[PDB]
Symmetry: C3
Subunit: 136 residues, 3 copies
């Protein structure tokens, strides 16, 4: 498996930030990797990956709200037939992937940092992200 | 071998998203790397790298259009007299670099993911990105 | 395992601090020649970016534009602490950046420097980490 695993999620609304930290960690533990990096990569162009505050759900609510204002869903100048241009912008804005450091078997994250799958075009039943580990 | 290759682009307009997936894949094949990661990095402060929809050109058109509204070219509060502040914002917003996973001698990309060089201050004759592979 | 923590004290709400030289000094001390460096903020309100390292007006303008895109005060914010805008700016530039190391130097274009982006200062003992992976 080359320390690579695909994870599956079902999302429940257009916009959703799903904390995936524990899934990543549990799987690092399973592989036995102690030091290196983890690449966490959405397989989608309308859902991304970010790191942000892990405790107050109002942070992620406010992130979703602000991004909805920065990139409104409807725009008169949009040409992309599918209608989900805003989700493509949001995905490129937070990133499709994040690179995390692994030290002594743990993700190197501050106390309040968690890893989120950022759904911008839900609800969808088939969402996926990949985690790939590289060891020192 | 260092598994690092630099690529040259000439861009033809202020804003341009150029699909560079083939350059990256071709270099992976040439190096014989089967599993690991690829770091794709712009050498510029006014062009970045992103992963987004790789089939409908209207996605790229709309991305450029939306970014132009988020970061208008002319802004009364700008101090940077060269006049390309907006390009600097766009570059930091999409990122100067992306990290991709390599599995079975190919990039791990979802169905519609491609890698784009995002020119925000063209046309320019000597744009560069670097592809660095790391092996398992 | 070539990982080091660095502390910074920031001096205003918004500050872009050039950390390039600090990263490069670590690399030189470890003797790592080729690989990658992962530069990662430990904070949800400060990020890491790569941008223009010569003209201070670029980073002034970056801070200004970000403050317009994500205004500090917003009637619809529910996060009562008041620093929502810092969270958005952090996710927008990124909490971390990956840099290539070649011949003991960061692979950076002429005007490219690495910045710690404070969006909720001034604070003491802001931190980032640098992890090196060698070929
Ligand atoms: Na970003």
């Amino acid at each position: 498996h080359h320390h690579m695993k695909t994870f599956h999620l079902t999302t429940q609304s257009r916009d959703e930030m799903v904390d995936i930290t524990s899934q990543i960690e549990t799987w690092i533990r399973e592989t036995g990797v102690t030091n290196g990096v983890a690449i966490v990569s959405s397989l989608h162009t309308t859902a991304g990956i970010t790191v942000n505050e892990n405790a107050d759900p109002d942070v992620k609510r406010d992130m979703i709200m602000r991004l909805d204002e920065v990139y409104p869903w409807h725009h008169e100048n949009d040409r992309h037939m599918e209608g989900n241009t805003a989700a493509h912008l949001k995905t490129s804005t937070v990133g499709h992937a994040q690179t995390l450091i692994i030290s002594e078997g743990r993700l190197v994250l501050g106390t309040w940092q968690g890893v989120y799958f950022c759904e911008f075009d839900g609800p969808r039943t088939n969402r996926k992200f990949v985690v790939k580990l590289l060891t020192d």
